[PDB]
């Protein structure tokens, strides 16, 4: 299904957006999470929906840990990843 590409596109879109801040250090962990989600999905591990769930949960958690403040656009993509991870 095209669900795989859908997931990859959401992950890369978010990676792009997260690099638009004044610094990148506070976002590196989240970028690592996305790179890993992309690798796992590219290598067909579990399902794209499962990888999206993990990416979303890990980013939501890190946002607490690194006190991250996402933009409307970033939150929109994150919500889309959460949605995909539910259906």
């Amino acid at each position: 299904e095209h669900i795989k590409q859908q997931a990859l596109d959401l992950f890369t879109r978010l990676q792009f957006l997260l690099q638009k801040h004044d610094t990148i250090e506070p976002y590196q962990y989240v970028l690592d999470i996305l790179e890993t989600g992309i690798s796992k999905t590219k290598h067909n591990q579990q399902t794209p929906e499962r990888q999206a769930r993990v990416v979303y949960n890990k980013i939501a958690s890190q946002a607490l840990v690194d006190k991250l403040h996402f933009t409307a656009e970033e939150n929109k993509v994150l919500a889309a990843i959460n949605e995909l991870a539910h259906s």
Side-chain angles (χ1 to χ4, degrees), residues 3-86:
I3 188 62
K4 176 180 181 174
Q5 192 57 235
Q6 296 273 182
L8 291 170
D9 294 334
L10 285 171
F11 299 157
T12 58
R13 174 65 185 303
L14 187 55
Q15 275 185 170
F16 170 70
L17 294 176
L18 293 175
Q19 293 176 63
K20 296 177 57 181
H21 297 278
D22 286 342
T23 60
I24 187 172
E25 179 185 36
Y27 301 99
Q28 191 56 55
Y29 192 121
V30 169
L31 290 170
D32 286 353
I33 291 168
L34 286 163
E35 196 61 48
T36 292
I38 291 169
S39 182
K40 285 167 172 288
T41 300
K42 284 184 175 178
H43 289 305
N44 303 138
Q45 297 300 297
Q46 288 139 293
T47 65
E49 295 94 324
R50 164 58 181 179
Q51 299 305 345
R53 174 181 175 59
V54 172
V55 163
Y56 182 81
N57 288 175
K58 282 180 159 47
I59 292 180
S61 179
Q62 206 54 27
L64 295 179
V65 177
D66 292 331
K67 196 75 86 311
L68 303 182
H69 304 292
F70 302 122
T71 66
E73 189 158 47
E74 287 162 354
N75 276 138
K76 179 164 163 294
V77 176
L78 279 162
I81 292 171
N82 197 194
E83 188 182 312
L84 185 159
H86 283 65

